[PDB]
Amino acid sequence: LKQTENDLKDIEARIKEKAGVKESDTGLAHPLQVARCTKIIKGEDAKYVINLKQIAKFVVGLGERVSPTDIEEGMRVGVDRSKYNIELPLPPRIDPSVTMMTVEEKPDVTYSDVGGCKDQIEKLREVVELPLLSPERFATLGIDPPKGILLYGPPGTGKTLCARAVANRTDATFIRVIGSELVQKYVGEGARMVRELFEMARTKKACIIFFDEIDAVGGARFDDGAGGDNEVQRTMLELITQLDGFDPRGNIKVMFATNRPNTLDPALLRPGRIDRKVEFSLPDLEGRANIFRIHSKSMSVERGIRWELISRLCPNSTGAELRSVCTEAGMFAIRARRKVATEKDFLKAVDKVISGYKK
Amino acid sequence: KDELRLLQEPGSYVGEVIKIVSDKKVLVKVQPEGKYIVDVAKDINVKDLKASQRVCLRSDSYMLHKVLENKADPLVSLMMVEKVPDSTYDMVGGLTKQIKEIKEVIELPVKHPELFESLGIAQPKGVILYGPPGTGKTLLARAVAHHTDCKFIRVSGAELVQKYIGEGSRMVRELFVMAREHAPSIIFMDEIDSIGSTRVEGSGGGDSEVQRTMLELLNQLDGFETSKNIKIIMATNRLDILDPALLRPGRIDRKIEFPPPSVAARAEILRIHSRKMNLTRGINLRKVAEKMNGCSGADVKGVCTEAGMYALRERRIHVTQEDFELAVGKVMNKNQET
Amino acid sequence: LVRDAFALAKEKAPTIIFIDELDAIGTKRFDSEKSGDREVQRTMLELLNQLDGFSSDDRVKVLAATNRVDVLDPALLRSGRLDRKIEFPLPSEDSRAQILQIHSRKMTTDDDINWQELARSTDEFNGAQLKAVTVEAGMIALRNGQSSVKHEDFVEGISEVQARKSKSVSFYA
Amino acid sequence: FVSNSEILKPFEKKQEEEKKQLEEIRGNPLSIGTLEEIIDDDHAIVTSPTMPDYYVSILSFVDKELLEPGCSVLLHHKTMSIVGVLQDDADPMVSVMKMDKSPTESYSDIGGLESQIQEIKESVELPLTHPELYEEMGIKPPKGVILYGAPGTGKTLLAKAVANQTSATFLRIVGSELIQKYLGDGPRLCRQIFKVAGENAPSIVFIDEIDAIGTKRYDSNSGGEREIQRTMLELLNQLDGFDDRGDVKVIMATNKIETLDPALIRPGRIDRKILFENPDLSTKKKILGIHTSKMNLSEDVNLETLVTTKDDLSGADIQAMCTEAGLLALRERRMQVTAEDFKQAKERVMKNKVEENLEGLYL
Amino acid sequence: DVGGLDMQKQEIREAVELPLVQADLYEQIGIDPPRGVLLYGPPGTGKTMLVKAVANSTKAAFIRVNGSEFVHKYLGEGPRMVRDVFRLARENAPSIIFIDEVDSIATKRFDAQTGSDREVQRILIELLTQMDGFDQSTNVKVIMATNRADTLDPALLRPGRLDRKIEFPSL
Amino acid sequence: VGKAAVVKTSSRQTVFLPMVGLVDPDKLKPNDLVGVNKDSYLILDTLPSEFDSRVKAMEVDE
Secondary structure: OOOOOOHHHOOHHHHHHHHHHHOOOOOOOOOOOOOOOOOOOOOOOOOOOOOOOOOOOOOOOOOOOOOOOOOOOOOOOOOOOOOOHHHOOOOOOOOOOOOOOEEEEOOOOOOOOOOOOHHHHHHHHHHHHHHHHOOOHHHHHOOOOOOEEEEEOOOOOOOOHHHHHHHHHHOOEEEEEEOOOOOOOOOOHHHHHHHHHHHHHHHOOOEEEEEEOHHHOOOOOOOOOOOOOOOHHHHHHHHHHHHHHHOOOOOEEEEEOOOOHHHOOHHHHOOOOEEEEEEOOOOOHHHHHHHHHHHHHHOOEOOOOOHHHHHHHOOOOOHHHHHHHHHHHHHHHHHHOOOOEOHHHHHHHHHHHHHHHOO | OHHHHHHOOOOEEEEEEEEEEOOOEEEEEOOOOOEEEEEOOOOOOOOOOOOOEEEEEEOOOOEEEEEOOOOOOOOOOOOOOEEOOOOOOOOOOOOHHHHHHHHHHHHHHHHOOHHHHHOOOOOOOEEEEOOOOOOOHHHHHHHHHHHOOOEEEEEOOOOOOOOOOOHHHHHHHHHHHHHHHOOOEEEEEOOOOOOOOOOOOOOOOOOOOOHHHHHHHHHHHHHHHOOOOEEEEEEOOOOOOOOHHHHOOOOOOEEEOOOOOOHHHHHHHHHHHHHHOOEOOOOOHHHHHOOOOOOOHHHHHHHHHHHHHHHHHOOOOOEOHHHHHHHHHHHHHHHHOO | OHHHHHHHHHHOOOOOEOOEOOHHHHOOOOOOHHHOOHHHHHHHHHHHHHHOOOOOOOOOOEOOEOOOOOOOOOOOOOOOOOOOOOOOOOOOOOHHHHHHHHHHHHOOOOOOOOHHHHOOOOOOOOHHHHHHHHHHHHOHHHHHOOOOOOHHHHHHHHOOOOOOOOOOOOOOO | OHHHHHOHHHHHHHOOOOHHHHHHHOOOOEEEEEEEEEOOOOEEEEEOOOOOOEEEEEOOOOOHHHOOOOOEEEEEOOOOOEOOOOOHHHOOOOOOOEEEOOOOOOOOOOOOOHHHHHHHHHHOHHHHHOOHHHHHOOOOOOOEEEEOOOOOOOOOHHHHHHHHHOOOEEEEEEOHHHOOOOOOHHHHHHHHHHHHOOOOOOEEEEEEOEOOOOOOOOOOOOOOOHHHHHHHHHHHHHHHHOOOOOOOOEEEEEOOOOOOOHHHHOEOOEOEEOOOOOOOHHHHHHHHHHHHHHOOEOOOOOHHHHOOOOOOOOHHHHHHHHHHHHHHHHHOOOOOEOHHHHHHHHHHHHHHOOOOOOOOOOO | OOOOOHHHHHHHHHHHHHHHHHOHHHHHHOOOOOOEEEEEOOOOOOOHHHHHHHHHHHOOEEEEOOOOOOOOOOOOHHHHHHHHHHHHHHHOOOEEEEEOOOHHHHOOOOOOOOOOOOOOOOHHHHHHHHHHHOOOOOOOEEEEEEOOOOOOOOOOOOOOOOOEEEEOOOO | OOOEEEEEOOOOOEEEEEOOOOOOOOOOOOOOOEEEOOOOOOEEEEOOOOOOOOOOOOOOOO
């Protein structure tokens, strides 16, 4: 097998390199990330001659032609940054972005770090849980749920597991899209990724489209709003033309996550699209107690401890600061050389968070 | 015959060897382009190419051409390494403690590194200059490299700090890579000098940014490079904008303070100029030192310049004692103001 | 776009041109930065040529709307250009009663609602913010257990019923 | 030479009529590029550092499973076809990457820090050497470590001492180089850190001297940057996504954590906070014993004499005192430092060589 | 062309004409020629028209480098351009560099400005390097005219390099 | 100067060429499509309006 594939360059690759390179490079020129043509004269109809490079840009006039399969020669055909006329039917949509997309239908997450967040659930009960369960109730109310729902709170807390808890009661599909990964070297990845989200939301009713880290995208940015390239500038079009105009409000819903509302486009913050603003508070004495008892099932502890007094000494804390109390509880047991964490280990773990941080 | 050969050459650039391939190729990094695999020349050994090896590549066929000597030569703005410049301890000297502290802090560890190694102790790689304004230690830095037969390296923070992204880093890493092979040398940094010779009194906004990308790469010489015989000459009268933690070893080791220009110290300073200057007979150089108080090195060269002005009005190549009494009277009122 | 908006003015018999957020290209402040990005400056330069194209033609109009006005341009102040300052402040108490009346007609209600009585609970709302109030007012019907939205559902929804300082401090704490 | 001649040499002798000639079919004019998309049609996308994006074909060398998008592969000059695959180290992964094997510093050379040695061991060395302590408790050991103090003492010695006992390569990453002030370079350099240390987990990640990414301020000016907001927020996903038994750790050093993003912090991921402590009496004694071993001491020099009057200088500053004592010995031309040199050295080191003076009157 | 300059007319020749022509006389004395001269007083009186008229007598290149010049938002080119001017001035001996309103350069940083202007302290690095950094030799005439200064001590003052301090008579 | 036109293509290359009778001074204007050469960048003839760079996300309602 080793010596068999060595001589294929002189036999099989001679035809492969001719049809895969010489034909593509003919005249200074199947996933297509690039296309180029130099001085091609073809009699308006299948003219093409489009240079994807920012240098020496071309246009196509003289009528309109639709050829989604093969425009002119096949081979190298592309759109990339600037969309010119009749080149729309064949966009270069290929990209290994599958690692970015995370789709979970009917998540099983109920309460882990979100114990005590039922106050925020009631905020999402009317405008999210209600339409995804009985959308026909809004017919007699006369109004309909708003398009989007805005999330607010501490950075990196409450925007992950709290969104999946609502989808459990409604048996919806939770799709998390990271906004920082929407920005790549390919111009238009943010707008193209949003296009496929509404396409999958029309097939299956009652789906949740979630956008993680919208500050990296927003409605505008430097390279798009202030720049010449179009990525986020074309992303806002998919949140307006598709969601508002074509898509009904009951079946398709949109939710974002951001640290500050001012980091977004004021055009999106206006009513008609983004209305509900959900602020993430911190769990109370009852909420912080239900989180510690769940983590105590996977961690060896003493059967005679009390999780109510553990959450009582600790003030209001985020979802991470509460998990730190259980993880640090095993560190103090190492000094005492014990297999389980006694009540005194949790008391020292709370003082480590109070004194070590003081926030 | 050499005309047709040289004039028809398309030209060749310089690149660094990354890795060697058993297929008789090599990967050479290109600055305007990037890493590109080329073919090893028939007269060049593929195994002799090491990492970061300086070689010459032809721009026509984009392959390997020749092999140069290994050294660090990035973009040079006031970074050029010189050898034994023109300076002497006689012109910038005149103080006993000033020169004596240099011998212990500089001359001993640089020339004889085995002195501190035999006792199992580290040797100072840095010094902080002190004293009132008007020292003259700037030209003294060139005397340190001239008499010790070392290489003089002047670091000017103005040329190494630019608005472009990465200039506060790359320009500092140029000194870091250069100091590896050129380690037997002497480095002198600017923009921090408060001592009064060349004094910018630091920078509030200039040292508030590049301070993070500079001091961290200087300490890596002992921690990472582990290179000796590297002398860092720094001068400041106060520590304010810089790192307060610079007092740790590896950066600030010894501190040489400029003694006050007393009568005994300035007596030999007047003997310095009198060798080059033309003087008459009956002149007391010790009495002139007693006529002033706290005369700096800048005022000594100033009063000698004033003394030469009265000699031009007399059309005499020698400066008479009467001209000194008129020159001392002017420098005292000039130094009193401000 | 200055010529593009004028290109559609040729064939179409009338025309009205609008500009959203004029302060972007209309306010130079103390900076010349219009020279830095020439799309902003040359946009204002093409307006002076297009506004002087048809002097007597009433079928070519150019308008602009923004938040505030900082930099004044007497060259732009004249007949045939933007001159008279028309301020659009926050609507008054009775001004929002007619806006909420139209929003109630677009939805399905009991038609027992008096728009004059609900205008007393509104403080500093524009035409767009009143649309969000009607959405939050219908959510009160779910808390009151009603199929439709009656007049009593608005009174509880128009006051605050969102965020603010809520119930944390009430009566005497 | 003797064994390989009778074993490995005859193996290639029978294949000399094939393996020798068939390897020359590739040629000497070959290039390098980066993969993009791989399919089963023997065609892919390759990009050289000059950005000549092309759609080429794939010669038969290894299966498509061994071709990873984003890794350097062996290409051709003219046709730009894929003739094989190469190592991914040619990728500009991290701007500053230095792998230091066998660090010199250890726990015995850092002085009286043993109070902090057993504490730092639990968060780094303990899960590497004995993960069963955290496994029997069903908890994950903290990956991150926060450092304080000054460089050369608490920000240096503590970093190189833990890598010695763990038998792991010291990997230093400059914190100020993590921000290129460009969109897309922030998350790229962060993901490549865990990639080089994530195969066999040979080394441990170390980061020191952060004056930049630690503080984003509110704006791209006044010391902060806009790319820091996206870099720190995305780096959190790499901390949760990275999972191991503790063979690889992340140790970062910063002066103040108040400017850090509470998202990237995420308590319970970082349980380790090292505060700078003043050296005790046993700290200076351990530093002297190293240098005084090779330096002959007189009869009037003892262990309790040098530690009698001290400001509790750190382990590095005590080393500077021994060097000054030897400097005075060179003035008298002798290799044995006497007791008269230490009296003049302690006055120069703590006053002349280090300016403190201990300003009083409640200050 | 202006009367009442007789006091300066003797001070101008020795600090300008002598070091660029007759400097060999200073070699007989044993001192290096003066590398410049300090001026005090507002511009317009024996400063603008006077100094520009002296360059015609000495046949030297008159270059205007002021305190409000080379002012731009790119960090580092300000001192870099200073490096290029004095480097060329070392090859050509007949050159004169006049500085008007040096107090703009002599100003130091009393506050941290963050963004905007950080360049206050950078322009002194290359100016002092070509003067206080090197030895005493005159390949060019650097004339620093001080407009208004009180507490500013850039070290440009004192007879370290420049020789005469000329103050415009107020009477 | 008067009989010659100054054109700047999308390639960041400005070419100075004398005007030809095939093109008219009113037909050559900025923000317009003027067909030129790919190699020599020489003005040939103007093109009709097709792609004007309409600046999308722009509401057009008659």
